[PDB]
Amino acid sequence: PIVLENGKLNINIDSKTGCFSVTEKTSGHVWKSDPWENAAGLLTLTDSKGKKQTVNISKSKKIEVSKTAKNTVSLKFIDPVFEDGSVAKGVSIATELRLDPNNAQLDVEVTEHRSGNFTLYDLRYPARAFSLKTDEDKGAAVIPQKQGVICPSYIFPMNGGRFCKWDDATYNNKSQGSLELFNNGTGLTMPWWGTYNEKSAVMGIVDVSARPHMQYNINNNGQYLFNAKGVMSPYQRIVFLDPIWKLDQEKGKMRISYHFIPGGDYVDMAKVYQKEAKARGHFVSLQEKLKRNPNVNKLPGAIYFGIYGGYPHYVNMPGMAFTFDELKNIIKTIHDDLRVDKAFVHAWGTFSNFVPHNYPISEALGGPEKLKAAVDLAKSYGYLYSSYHAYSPMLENDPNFTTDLMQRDAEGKLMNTGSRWARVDPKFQKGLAQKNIEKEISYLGLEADITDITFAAYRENGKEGRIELAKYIDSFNLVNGTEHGQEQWIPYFDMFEGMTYLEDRPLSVISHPAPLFNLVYHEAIANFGKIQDPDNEVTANGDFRIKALRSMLFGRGTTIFFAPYEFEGMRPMIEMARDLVSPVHKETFYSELKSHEYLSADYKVQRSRFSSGTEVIANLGPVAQKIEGGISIPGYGYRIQMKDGSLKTGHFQVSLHMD
Amino acid sequence: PIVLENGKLNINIDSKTGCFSVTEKTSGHVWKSDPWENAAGLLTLTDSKGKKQTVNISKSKKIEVSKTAKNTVSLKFIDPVFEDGSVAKGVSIATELRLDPNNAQLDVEVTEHRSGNFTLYDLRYPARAFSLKTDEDKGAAVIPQKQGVICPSYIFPMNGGRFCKWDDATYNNKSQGSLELFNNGTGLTMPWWGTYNEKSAVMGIVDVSARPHMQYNINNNGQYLFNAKGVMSPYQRIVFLDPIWKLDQEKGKMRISYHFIPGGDYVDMAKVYQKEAKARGHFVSLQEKLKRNPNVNKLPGAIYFGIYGGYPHYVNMPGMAFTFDELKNIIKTIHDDLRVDKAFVHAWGTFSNFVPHNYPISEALGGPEKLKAAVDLAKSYGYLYSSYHAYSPMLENDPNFTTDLMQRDAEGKLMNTGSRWARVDPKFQKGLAQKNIEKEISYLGLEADITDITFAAYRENGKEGRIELAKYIDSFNLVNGTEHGQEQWIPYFDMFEGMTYLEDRPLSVISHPAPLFNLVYHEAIANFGKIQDPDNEVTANGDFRIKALRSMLFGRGTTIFFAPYEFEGMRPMIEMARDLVSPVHKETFYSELKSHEYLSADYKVQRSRFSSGTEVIANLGPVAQKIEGGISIPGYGYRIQMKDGSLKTGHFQVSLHMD
Numbered sequence A, B: 001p002i003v004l005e006n007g008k009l010n011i012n013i014d015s016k017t018g019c020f021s022v023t024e025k026t027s028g029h030v031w032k033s034d035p036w037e038n039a040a041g042l043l044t045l046t047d048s049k050g051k052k053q054t055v056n057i058s059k060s061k062k063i064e065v066s067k068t069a070k071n072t073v074s075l076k077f078i079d080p081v082f083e084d085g086s087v088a089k090g091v092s093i094a095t096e097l098r099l100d101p102n103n104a105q106l107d108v109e110v111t112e113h114r115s116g117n118f119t120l121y122d123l124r125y126p127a128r129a130f131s132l133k134t135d136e137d138k139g140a141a142v143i144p145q146k147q148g149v150i151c152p153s154y155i156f157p158m159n160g161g162r163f164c165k166w167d168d169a170t171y172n173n174k175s176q177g178s179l180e181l182f183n184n185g186t187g188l189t190m191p192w193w194g195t196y197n198e199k200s201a202v203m204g205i206v207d208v209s210a211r212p213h214m215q216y217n218i219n220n221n222g223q224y225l226f227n228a229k230g231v232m233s234p235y236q237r238i239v240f241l242d243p244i245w246k247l248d249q250e251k252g253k254m255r256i257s258y259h260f261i262p263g264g265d266y267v268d269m270a271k272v273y274q275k276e277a278k279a280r281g282h283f284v285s286l287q288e289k290l291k292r293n294p295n296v297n298k299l300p301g302a303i304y305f306g307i308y309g310g311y312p313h314y315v316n317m318p319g320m321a322f323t324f325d326e327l328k329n330i331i332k333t334i335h336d337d338l339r340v341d342k343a344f345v346h347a348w349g350t351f352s353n354f355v356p357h358n359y360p361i362s363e364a365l366g367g368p369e370k371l372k373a374a375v376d377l378a379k380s381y382g383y384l385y386s387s388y389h390a391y392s393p394m395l396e397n398d399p400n401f402t403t404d405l406m407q408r409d410a411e412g413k414l415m416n417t418g419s420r421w422a423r424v425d426p427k428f429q430k431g432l433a434q435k436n437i438e439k440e441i442s443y444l445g446l447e448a449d450i451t452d453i454t455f456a457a458y459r460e461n462g463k464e465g466r467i468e469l470a471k472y473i474d475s476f477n478l479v480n481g482t483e484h485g486q487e488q489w490i491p492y493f494d495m496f497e498g499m500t501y502l503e504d505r506p507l508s509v510i511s512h513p514a515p516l517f518n519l520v521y522h523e524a525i526a527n528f529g530k531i532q533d534p535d536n537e538v539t540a541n542g543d544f545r546i547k548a549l550r551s552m553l554f555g556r557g558t559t560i561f562f563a564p565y566e567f568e569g570m571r572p573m574i575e576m577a578r579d580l581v582s583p584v585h586k587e588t589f590y591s592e593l594k595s596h597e598y599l600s601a602d603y604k605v606q607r608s609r610f611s612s613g614t615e616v617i618a619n620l621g622p623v624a625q626k627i628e629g630g631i632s633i634p635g636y637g638y639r640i641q642m643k644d645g646s647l648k649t650g651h652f653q654v655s656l657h658m659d
Ligand SMILES: O[C@@H]1[C@@H]2OC[C@H]1OC[C@@H]2O
Pocket: A164, A165, A168, B312, B421, B452, B453, B483, B531
């Protein structure tokens, strides 16, 4: 067995299979290779008949493992063997394992692949590596799915209903699949993932040029590999996360950089990636943004209000649209009656054309002067204001609809026929914004802007047009936000609307929310709840009690998103956000989220520490629970140490008012 | 054009295509044939290269349509044509339209199909019939998905976040797909569906011998049919529900019976099927069951308590399992401190072997005498009691695991390798129950029983074994319940745990819960909330405020499902359920749910009337709303007229206590 070793790590590479283990020498923990099949990698390719098959590349006809430098092992997998005994002659995979001379870091790279007369697709490499043994290792997989989750590697006490769904998912297909990088759906928002137990942690950072997918397996024994054969899996329940290199489309460097952290967990992983985020240029702190624009300080302690008038979906929809006088009175009530000191007012429905023509200010809703009177009132309060804007949609029900600004593929067919909100080719979107945004800014004296959709993901197609639009919006130096966001867009915005959680998502029944994105980026980008899942709606992600406490733990601001007719029903939640969340949000806004901890066995009691000197403890479950020192945290309760030495304690209560 | 007609309906059949329209003569409403492509049916079959294609059968080379009787038209679709111009020579579909001589009822049957050298799969017939025009018809599709939903045929005011998800889903693939009959997942619980506008309603009742699937299209314009071609759909947004006949599988009579109801809605549809439900033998009333077993009267006004000790998933799991003394103390507190007058106590974890060996009573938890003391205490309060039982599982972590009791398919492969809870062949399950259930009944003096899993669905395979087990359990004449249930099992049980809603489900963002199953069966089967989604958990289906109010509207009982460590957190919800839901559940338990109404434009205010004389009005949204006569229903509030004429009004409040 070929060995790479420095002071912190030892890489044990098998000469016959190419599998490797990693001994983390400070703790002594050994990361084993594939526990199921001893597979260095899993390669999906066509056979002689043309059918797709997945093969174990350690079963290849020739395997060359040679120590090639002081700290480099080169591997070559030549002529894989199919299930029927036939050979994929002329197919080869070349890889490299490169140990850092000093640090506990191992680069893994697929350097070459040859197809011969076959077609290569997915390669899991390394396969089923860095796994945790279910109910023996007491740790978790760490997955930055949107704001982020952890997936414990062992069964633990929890509500009986949750428990049944949790355990069942680890035995069926809910616990296996793949996610993609940098989308606003089910996918990841940072190019890393990891696993840890009580002794040691490992996380892998994907090369900036590459777009692998991430395979997950959360305590599943691999029964999904045997269902079609109708036999029982012979494998052990394990947790692993694998890169999936898309060999049929990947043009970048197929490299992942593994970092090994004695005693680390998801916090330590996030702080490792934070260094790489700064080196990649994503990290532009809110302090620098405030130096450039003093109005950024209107955001700490601000509640984000979305007044949804049925727009952009419909123009002046009866029963949904607000007039500008109605908008002005909502603003006045929020300040004068509800005593809200700071706010971002976002008015969905101020123009009489459909997006992407964000003009004119609608005559039917009252006209420009009445809109200016509403914005002027908000500004007199120190509130931020923006209309709803989007430059990406092309809507069927728009009388101005045309396919002119839509993109066509190489066969001349329209793209995004299935995504009505993202149909305008990004190379046109700056031009569309230029039609009226400067006129609205100067007429209303705008201090703020929110632009929706265009920056919710970071895909390659159209990226140049999106950067052009981001640079243009940024040149105005407004306090500005965008829907969802991604790390690549952080330099151009002050806040992201979202970057929290989908309601229905893979892993939802077998994961806990963890503030992974904010552990990296809280100093750099402010985030608020998503308008589809606001703090006033009861969803899979919780009611107001749960969402307000999670807001303070994770460091995001409150989102109240409502149709006008709902407004009277919003008042109690606005008041509670005002009294509880707003002061914590304000104090912690610019700070680093230094640490996050789960303090109860059911993961419902949690503790977050911010570099402003603020400590948030909250209990997101119904029963009181004790933490160290015998302190009790009430159900749906909190214990918050503020910078000024005050201790905020309390809890939410649901009461029945029988007349 | 060929005409079938009686005093109520006129059927116009096109001789060129086989499409037909139905005029309801009293209202002038015309139900149209396929508005998109004028297809009588859509047939999926292999071509001469063996690739599956879907064809419009009205494009067949030879279409024959003629009156073969006074009220029968026979149709023959001969030699379908593919899109490339080639003919599926020797394929034929024969159908019949049979008008009832007196009633507004049309039977539609696929009587014959020939495949030649081709293979036939799905047949949508009739294709895209009985549709509603989106934003013109103001009605809904009616779908008995579990407890049931309606899908409105127009856009209407609602919370802005809900609105965005709603409208967006009608444009993408979330609004098209198919469901199956009689499962405990995403599917239907009654063999009917329908559509209605403000003028008239139509529903189709599937023949008892057939198992079609149901295709849905909820306000979608068919863009899903054109995305692969990269063109914009030229069709209009419509609502339709189609039977999918599985020609490759179906052995029953492929008949659907359409009933046309002037001025009807989902309530009238349910009452039409209720007559058929009785004719089919499903309907055995709770009054009959009470006559046979007076202990049935321990259910009205009872809270269903599931004490979840980590079983059947684990045996004596630390941190989850309760001792029998702890169980006894929970029963005492519920009665003495929480003053719960009636209850069903369901203890998950009383045996020291894994299911399906439901024995012996665990010595580690205290042994038989201490369990008997807990059960004796419950009986002294008049409470019902059952342990957790299941005879269907075969679990990987059971030391007694064997594939000997599992079922194999025609190829000899194990079935249900991916469904650990339903692996034992039903033909073995009565014998597994016989091993100890009579000894538990005799030793504990049991009055009740709940058996899980086996009766949650109604599939053809294994049904003889399940019927055998159901008869055996029913022969004990205990007050008995089972997980989820289906209509076919109603004669054998007194209560169903479930028959509510999945949390994640197709159509969830474009439908409203409606009590369709209980509008049929409330007199015949009691139902309670599902243990995965109990009234103490905050989920996609609501918090305690929403679930308690929906409980009273739909006529279901309270479910409190908890791990023992949560108990102290359950107290406020047990109290509010006791004060509000339990007296209404008690009064309405045996009655017919005569009617259900949506009273507000956002469908959140609702009114239910029970044949006990009880009226429930509730507001499941945050804002107060006015109904007829200017009466105001507070957000999360109610207005209940009891049988004795007294009025109850009130509302839930969420408060923030700050020390
Ligand atoms: O997990 C399920 C749950 O416990 C075992 C499974 O079946 C019966 C209950 O629904």
